[PDB]
Amino acid sequence: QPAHLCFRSFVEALKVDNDLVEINTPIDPNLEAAAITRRVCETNDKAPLFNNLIGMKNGLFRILGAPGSLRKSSADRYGRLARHLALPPTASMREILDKMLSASDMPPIPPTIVPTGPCKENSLDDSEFDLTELPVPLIHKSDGGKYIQTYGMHIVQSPDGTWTNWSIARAMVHDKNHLTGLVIPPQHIWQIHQMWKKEGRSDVPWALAFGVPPAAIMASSMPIPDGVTEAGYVGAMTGSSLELVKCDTNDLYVPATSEIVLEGTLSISETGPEGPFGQMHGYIFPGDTHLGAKYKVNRITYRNNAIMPMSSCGRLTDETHTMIGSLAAAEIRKLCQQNDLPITDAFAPFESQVTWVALRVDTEKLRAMKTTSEGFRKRVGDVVFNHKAGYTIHRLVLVGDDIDVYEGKDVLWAFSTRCRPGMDETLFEDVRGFPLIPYMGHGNGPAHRGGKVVSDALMPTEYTTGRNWEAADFNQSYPEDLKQKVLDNWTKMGFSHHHH
Amino acid sequence: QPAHLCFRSFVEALKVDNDLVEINTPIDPNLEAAAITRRVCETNDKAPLFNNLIGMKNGLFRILGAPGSLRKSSADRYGRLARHLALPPTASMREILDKMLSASDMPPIPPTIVPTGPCKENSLDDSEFDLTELPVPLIHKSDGGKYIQTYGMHIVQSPDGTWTNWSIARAMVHDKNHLTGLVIPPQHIWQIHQMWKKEGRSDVPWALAFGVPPAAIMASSMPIPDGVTEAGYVGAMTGSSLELVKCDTNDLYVPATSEIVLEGTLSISETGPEGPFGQMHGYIFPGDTHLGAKYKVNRITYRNNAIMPMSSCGRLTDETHTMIGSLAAAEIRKLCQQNDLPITDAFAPFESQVTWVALRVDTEKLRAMKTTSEGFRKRVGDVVFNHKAGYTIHRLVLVGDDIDVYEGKDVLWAFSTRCRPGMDETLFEDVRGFPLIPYMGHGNGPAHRGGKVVSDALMPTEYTTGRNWEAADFNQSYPEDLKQKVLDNWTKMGFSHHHH
Ligand SMILES: Cc1cc2c3c(c1C)C(C)(C)C[C@@H]([C@@H](F)Cc1ccccc1)N3c1c(nc(O)[nH]c1=O)N2C[C@H](O)[C@H](O)[C@H](O)COP(=O)(O)O
């Protein structure tokens, strides 16, 4: 099976890439696995594969940390992500995001049902497993539970059967046969839950699949449109129909090569304590537990020698930055274009803790609109902040064509020098806010509303006659022939490789 | 002479430090010297000493570029600056700024007059020099003149004789015997100029000394208080009285070891074209010339084998960041403390193009004030933005004790996650603005007023009961004994020096 279609093959690919460290001595799931992974993420090291996890029994489970985190070199910085998608390991962010967007104007390729797969190699019924006895990690010392679910895919379907959603949402062990987790608006798992709660007749049939096809977990982390079944979008993106097997205890379908599958229900009535969790902005508020959604597990199926992927998330850089931010930015780029806005590129700078998105403007097109900053900021912010794709993002930074939005240094330069505080900004208080940001849910104002801004880092002539400056930098302040002479004599004179 | 007291000795020190590249083949002052220096500054390379400058005659002149720029290693990042001050080359920013502030509660040590010095080795009267014939650099391709003055010290004295100011302000060659330059409020050269213009009787006696004692050029770049003679402040800082010689054509006094001295007058009546200049925010606006102040040169004196220091300024990182921003931040720290504000540290993040200052708050003291964000932001911003030390700074970011304001990554983290846009900010429109920032002088609003903000990145409990989070990072989310085990087994397991 190809790496992008089979998690087990993806793990091989990381090895082959010299991007894996296999740890075969005993490692404790209580903090140690996550501490090693945290260190990896903070230093862009190789992904850790914990083959000897204290508490692993009967095949459950090994852990792969940092599956979507960064590599140290510039040349293959995003290689782990490229390996989710069959792209060369040197792919740029633009190329990765374009791949993730490509299925948006293709016909879906619906999945293919097969009779069995590796995820059926082992099973545990409802008298044989106990989720408190598995080697579930404690990821951060102050977490409110052991977070089994940081990189699996929840599968729920609308009551009418017409939409099956795949998404990542956190969940922790509640007791031997239940989880609690986040299920919050406007997320699709919440939207589908609401449909079942209005029908009122039953709990939501559910599955949670860990170690799914890498291309599937990327779509699971992306805000593709309402009503769009991720499996068909991934099929179109990859050019292949995904192979799914039916659950044993319900009629949902899971990837055939899933490492571990939980089958059960998401309650339409019950809740239980959930959180706190150290997360994507870099914080944990010890003791802030809240009621979350409650899942009942009826069955586990799993591969021989199953591997659980884990995100040890928090401060830079991990999956909560590389995937959540970048994939939201991709969708925002498309949304803006579909609303006739002259946006060429979008990215969530890591330096902003993926709370900003920088939008690169085609300023030739802007000039033809014959508009002003106030009007344009309002239009952009109305489009983005009124849409689910904009949910996580609290500051949009508009930049002209000279800025590479994938380079945070350049975004910061433009923001700091081209956007006058106050005058060049529009605040949005009557939009949905993202409560997870500390200044929202632990801040001075409403946790769920407002706190958003469009910051215009377009200069005045960019709306009228064109850019009227040159940068005071080596690139722009010296002629080509001089630059090349400098470069060619650099080591000669006495001063100081692309791969490294 | 010690390095901090004599520029010629400072140049030796850089060599000795393996922090100099001597270029002994011909280099063109038309762009080439500045392009090499620009490249140095963008890559934190060794400082260039151009010993064979095309157009050098009769000893005028060699060029040293990048005198106050950064070194590549973390361990001696600020070593060039430390070498201006007799500090170890590993000194921290806190230590450098503390040294620069130390004279603020010491008695001045006034300078000592000596009969001669190296700056008198050669002279050119007013029939022997022509400033258009010297190898003055063109620093950026679009500059409006050849900027002779990027790292010398202007010397002007109040009409009553009681205040002699030393400061850096740019100036370019106008004709054979005149310069034009910036002389703008609230700068001390402007304040003294105004005193002479109100008296109305004569032009301002002036000298411009290049290659002055390094400790003197640091004070020249710092906003020490109105009325304070820099020479006595430097004397106190260094513990020694500076040796000065009298000018030949006026009664001002210049450092004895100055490399090059211009003597003449700053007009109280005349102006001439000045600029544009590629500068500290990273821009040049080709063609934006304005009238500037006009200087007449009557005499040149200089050392044998004189060296002119040059700042090839623009995008990160050069003297306009390391010195202007850091030294302003130092003064702001002191100002805040003298106004009873609980500020421990201040720094202008390079990532903000030195347009922000981050202020670290002693939150124990804040808690005892029993105040609120709105009130505290207003108080801080009134103090800073109403003072000359705050002139260049358009955003103040308040952070708690966990943030190291000298680390831009941490400032950006705090700003992005702890300050709710709008609600947690106070805009200041009725304060002096810094017109050099593009969004000011080339922006949508008044060039000289407003555009300032205090952004409060203190969390709510920091005002009341104390920090209520822990970071989701390796440092804070794992116990000490576990962290140390991870570190001690890191290379063992398979993962990857302080000087490198
Ligand atoms: C890659 C990734 C994604 C998420 C999450 C995680 C990772 C590693 C973690 C490690 C489990 C952390 C959390 C976390 F990142 C939480 C969060 C909540 C809302 C929006 C964005 C982020 N998690 C997650 C969460 N979303 C929650 O609702 N709920 C969640 O708990 N997302 C983001 C989510 O997968 C995307 O927003 C996706 O678009 C959802 O799919 P949908 O468009 O089909 O609803």
Ligand SMILES: Cc1cc2c3c(c1C)C(C)(C)C[C@@H]([C@@H](F)Cc1ccccc1)N3c1c(nc(O)[nH]c1=O)N2C[C@H](O)[C@H](O)[C@H](O)COP(=O)(O)O
């Ligand atoms: C280190 C340094 C400092 C400056 C300047 C430069 C350097 C390398 C350059 C390369 C010549 C560029 C320019 C430039 F940075 C301009 C500027 C203008 C106002 C405030 C801050 C910065 N320059 C300069 C300028 N000031 C102008 O007015 N006028 C100036 O032209 N400063 C900053 C200045 O030295 C400090 O603001 C200092 O506090 C002034 O001394 P004072 O407090 O005694 O008035």
Ligand SMILES: [K+]
């Ligand atoms: K999704």
Ligand SMILES: [K+]
């Ligand atoms: K703007």
Ligand SMILES: [K+]
């Ligand atoms: K000064």
Ligand SMILES: [K+]
């Ligand atoms: K705040």
Ligand SMILES: [Mn+2]
């Ligand atoms: Mn969806």
Ligand SMILES: [Mn+2]
């Ligand atoms: Mn002064």
